[PDB]
Amino acid sequence: SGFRKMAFPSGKVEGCMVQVTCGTTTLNGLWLDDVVYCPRHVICTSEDMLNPNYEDLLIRKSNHNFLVQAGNVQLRVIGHSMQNCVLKLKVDTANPKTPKYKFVRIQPGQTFSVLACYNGSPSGVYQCAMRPNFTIKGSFLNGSCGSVGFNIDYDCVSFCYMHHMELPTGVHAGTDLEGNFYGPFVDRQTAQAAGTDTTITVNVLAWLYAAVINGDRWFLNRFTTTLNDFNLVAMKYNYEPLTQDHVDILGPLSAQTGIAVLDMCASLKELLQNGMNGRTILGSALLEDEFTPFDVVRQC
Amino acid sequence: FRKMAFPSGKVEGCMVQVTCGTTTLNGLWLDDVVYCPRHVICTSEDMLNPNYEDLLIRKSNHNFLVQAGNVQLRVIGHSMQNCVLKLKVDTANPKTPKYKFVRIQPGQTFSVLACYNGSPSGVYQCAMRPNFTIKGSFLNGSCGSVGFNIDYDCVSFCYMHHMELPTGVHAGTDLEGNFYGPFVDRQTAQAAGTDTTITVNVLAWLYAAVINGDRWFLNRFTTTLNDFNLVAMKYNYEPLTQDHVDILGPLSAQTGIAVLDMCASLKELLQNGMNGRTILGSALLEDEFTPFDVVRQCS
C-alpha cells in the first residue's frame, strides 16, 4: 500500500526566482529570458490597496524605481509594461538558467507544485490542486506573493499559477502567467467571498480505481447507478457533479479493472452514507481528491 | 498549513545512475566519490545469503557503469563502508554543495528526493518512524534515493534508501552505511516492529492549530508527566520526557499554553475522540511535524 502526494523537483524553478522591490514593498518575481514577471500590486502602498488606480500609479514610475535582485547580482530594469494583473519588467541581461518553458492556464481539479518563496529565496515546495472555487489551500505567509505553480514534463516546465492575494477565509488566489485571475477575484483589498468548496468527484474516483489495482477491495458493492441518480446524491454531500466527459476520462482505468464507472459511483455512494468504519484505503483514512486521472493512469 | 519539503535543486545535480551487471539503481555523487547501496553487486539469485566481502573481491573497476546524464564516469577504485559502496571516479562533481553526513533519531523529519535510474522524479517530506521505517513512495528502481535537510546554505544528508519491506514501509541507512532499525540487506522475511505515534510531534501540531486560531480543544484542566504517559502508553503514544517539554518551550511562550496543560487536551482527544470535529481540517492527529517545523513554517 501507500500513495504519497509527491511534488515535482524544484531545481529548474529555483534559479528563476528573484526579488523585486518598489519603494517599500518587496515580493517575488519570475526571471525568464530577459523578462521578470511579478504581481502588479507591487506598485501599491497599503493605502492604495482599497481602490488602486493601476494606470495612474504606473505612468508615474520610472525604470529606476524597480530594484530587481537575483541573489547578490542586481539587475537593471530597461523598461516595463502591464499585462492584465501582472507586471513585466524587461532587464538588460537574460537569465542563463532559463529552462525550456511554457505557459498554460489550468482548470479546477488539476494539480501542480508550488515553490513557496520569501524575498526571492525558495523556502519550500508542496503539491496541491486548484479547488472548484478557484482557490488553493496552501501555506503562504506575508511575503510569498509571486511564488509560482508549475508542472514538469520530460524537460519542459509548465507555469500555470502565480500567487497574488490571501483571502480572509485563509485561502489564496492568483493568476495565470498572462495575468488573468482564476475565479472572480480582483487585486483590491475589498471584501471578496470564495464560493463553496466542494470535493473533486472525478479525482476521488480515479484514486479508488488505483486502490482496486493495488489490492484494496473491501468497499466494492454489487450495485450500479445512473449518472443522474448519482449526482442527485453526491450533491447532498457537497461533491462536484460528474459529466460524460469525466466518465470517458476514467475509461482506461475501468478497462484495466473490470469495474464500470457507474459501478464505482455506486460504491462511492455507499462510502458516503456509511463512512470508513475504521478501515483505510491505500493507507489513507480520508477520501483523497488531489490525485487526477492523468496522474493515476501514468504511475500505476 | 501544508507539509512542505525542502527545495531540491542542490541535491538534484548530485544524483547519478550506477549499473553493475543487470542491476541498476541510484547513486549520490559528491566530490569525486559515488555512494550507493552495496547490494548493487548482487544478482537476484545472490541476495539469499550474500557474502559481500567475497563478492566484492571478484569485482573490478570496469564492472561499474556510472552515468551522470549523458556523460559517463570512470570508476578508478572501490571500497565498502558497512552497507554502502564507495566508487572513486575520475572527475569531481562541480555541482557539489556544502554538505554534511548526520545520523538522525526516530521522530525527526526530512525531505526525500525519490529517483529512478539516476533521474529525480519527485520530492516529499516524511518522518523517521519510531520503528525505524518511513512511509514513503518508492517503486522498483528507487534504491539509493536520498533523504536530506537543508541548513541555511548546508545540505545535511541523513538517509539512503536500501529496501522495501512487504508492508508498504521502506528501510535504509545513513550515508556512513549504518542501518536504521533491525534490518539486514538480504532478501528474507523481515518485520517492522510495532509503529507508535510520535507524541511530541502531535503536541507541536496542536500548538500550530492554536496559532492559526483553532482553539476548541483547550480546557481548564492539566495533568502530570506521569499520569499522561499512562494514557499515552495505553493508546500507543511514545512516552514524554522532560527534554520534550523543554523543546516545546518556545511554542508555549508564543501561545501561553503550558506543555502539561496542552497535554490535558491531548488526553481528552484520545479517550473521547474528536466528537465529529476537525483540527486544522483533519479528523486525525498529525504526527509528522516536529516542533522546529512549526517554528519554521509559522514564526
From Swiss-Prot, chain B:
Stretches assigned to the Peptidase C30 domain: 1-299
Glycyl lysine isopeptide (Lys-Gly) (interchain with G-Cter in ubiquitin) cross-link, chain position(s): 3, 88
Annotated phenotype, changing residue 143 to A: Complete loss of 3C-like proteinase nsp5 cleavage
Reaction equation(s) it catalyzes: TSAVLQ-|-SGFRK-NH2 and SGVTFQ-|-GKFKK the two peptides corresponding to the two self-cleavage sites of the SARS 3C-like proteinase are the two most reactive peptide substrates. The enzyme exhibits a strong preference for substrates containing Gln at P1 position and Leu at P2 position
Ranges of the Cytoplasmic topological domain: 1-299
Effect seen on changing residue 47 to A: Does not affect ability to cleave and inactivate human TRMT1
Activity: how regulated: Inhibited by pyridone-containing alpha-ketoamides compounds 13a and 13b. In turn, alpha-ketoamide 13b (tert-butyl (1-((S)-1-(((S)-4-(benzylamino)-3,4-dioxo-1-((S)-2-oxopyrrolidin-3-yl)butan-2-yl)amino)-3-cyclopropyl-1-oxopropan-2-yl)-2-oxo-1,2-dihydropyridin-3-yl)carbamate) inhibits SARS-CoV-2 replication in human lung cells. Inhibited ex vivo by michael acceptor inhibitor N3. Inhibited ex vivo by compound 11a and 11b.
Cellular location(s): Host cytoplasm; Host Golgi apparatus; Host nucleus
List of catalytic residues: 39, 143
Subunit structure, interactors included: 3CL-PRO exists as monomer and homodimer. Only the homodimer shows catalytic activity. Interacts with host FBXO22; this interaction promotes the proteasomal degradation of nsp5.
Job of this protein: Cleaves the C-terminus of replicase polyprotein at 11 sites. Recognizes substrates containing the core sequence [ILMVF]-Q-|-[SGACN]. Cleaves and inactivates human TRMT1, preventing tRNA guanine(26)-dimethylation of tRNAs. May cleave human NLRP1 in lung epithelial cells, thereby activating the NLRP1 inflammasome pathway. May cleave human GSDMD, triggering alternative GSDME-mediated epithelial cell death upon activation of the NLRP1 inflammasome, which may enhance the release interleukins 1B, 6, 16 and 18. Also able to bind an ADP-ribose-1''-phosphate (ADRP).
Protein name per its UniProtKB record: 3C-like proteinase nsp5
